[PDB]
Design a protein around this ligand. Structure first.
Ligand SMILES: CC(=O)N[C@@H]1[C@@H](O[C@H](C)C(=O)O)[C@H](O[C@@H]2O[C@H](CO)[C@@H](O)[C@H](O)[C@H]2NC(C)=O)[C@@H](CO)O[C@H]1O
Ligand SMILES: [Cl-]
Ligand SMILES: [Cl-]
Ligand SMILES: [Cl-]
Ligand SMILES: [Cl-]
Ligand SMILES: [Cl-]
Ligand SMILES: [Cl-]
Ligand SMILES: [Cl-]
Ligand SMILES: [Cl-]
Ligand SMILES: [Cl-]
Ligand SMILES: [Cl-]
Ligand SMILES: [Cl-]
Ligand SMILES: [Cl-]
Ligand SMILES: [Cl-]
Ligand SMILES: [Cl-]
Length: 222
């Protein structure tokens, strides 16, 4: 179980490698992050981003629906978020928080899906290519997996996170974002503050319901 493979400096050089997309929000839009910004963002500073999200939390449907109140297309879908938690062993507070970041609090125009013929495809976790061209050409994960409803996008997103990240030993946000076992490969997002945004919402929800934190991992680099 020895997944500590690289020094921090080695990992930084890899994250700064040729063509690797690393972005930051500036003047209201996303721009490429510079080398210093990338390095700063990946620095370990001790802690929601380091918490194991493969452990479930005791949240009832009513509690999850409280989190989802006023969240657009996600409102009143707490039953299904909990279906996903139990089927796939995925922390439901994490799952909600991720969906809220990825969909603009459930209110973005993209969160309402992409039409293709008689069907509409939904994607609430930023998974794969998700625009009209990718849906038309058929080179969209959401279309491939037939996420033809919001509920199917909630379940399927969870299934994807479990099967592709959690089963790959990327068990916390930091690992999902920066894959320290194999730096610069298989990273969930280009936004250098992706983990911080999800972690902030998670912490608020933990403190709202009095939830206890699961295991926090400290060490990633030689
Ligand atoms: C969840 C997702 O789709 N995230 C995008 C991410 O893809 C990850 C790795 C995934 O499919 O789970 C994507 O990362 C690149 O993906 C291409 C394959 O499409 C790879 O060839 C690259 O090596 C990946 N790069 C890294 C650094 O992992 C990124 C690209 O910016 O976008 C994420 O939204
Ligand atoms: Cl480059
Ligand atoms: Cl990339
Ligand atoms: Cl309930
Ligand atoms: Cl929008
Ligand atoms: Cl995302
Ligand atoms: Cl895709
Ligand atoms: Cl992609
Ligand atoms: Cl639905
Ligand atoms: Cl990759
Ligand atoms: Cl990997
Ligand atoms: Cl981070
Ligand atoms: Cl506090
Ligand atoms: Cl608890
Ligand atoms: Cl470390």
């Amino acid at each position: 179980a020895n997944d500590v493979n690289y020094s921090f400096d080695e990992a930084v050089s890899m994250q700064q490698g040729k063509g690797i997309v690393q972005t930051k929000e500036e003047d209201g839009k996303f721009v490429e992050a510079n080398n210093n910004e990338i390095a700063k963002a990946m620095t370990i500073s001790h802690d929601m981003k380091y918490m194991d999200i493969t452990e479930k939390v005791p949240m009832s449907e009513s509690e999850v629906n409280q989190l989802l109140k006023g969240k657009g297309i996600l409102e009143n879908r707490g039953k299904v978020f909990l279906e996903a938690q139990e089927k796939y062993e995925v922390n439901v507070i994490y799952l909600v928080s991720h969906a809220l970041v990825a969909t603009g609090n459930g209110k973005s125009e993209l969160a309402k899906g992409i039409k293709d013929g008689k069907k509409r495809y939904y994607n609430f976790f930023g998974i794969g290519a998700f625009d009209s061209s990718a849906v038309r050409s058929g080179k969209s994960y959401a279309e491939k997996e037939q996420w033809t409803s919001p509920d199917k996008a909630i379940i399927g997103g969870a299934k994807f996170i479990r099967n592709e990240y959690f089963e790959n030993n990327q068990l916390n946000l930091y690992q999902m974002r920066w894959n320290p076992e194999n730096p610069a490969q298989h990273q969930y997002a280009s936004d250098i503050r992706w983990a911080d945004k999800i972690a902030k919402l998670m912490d608020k929800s933990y403190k709202q319901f009095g939830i206890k934190k699961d295991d926090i991992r400290q060490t990633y680099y030689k």
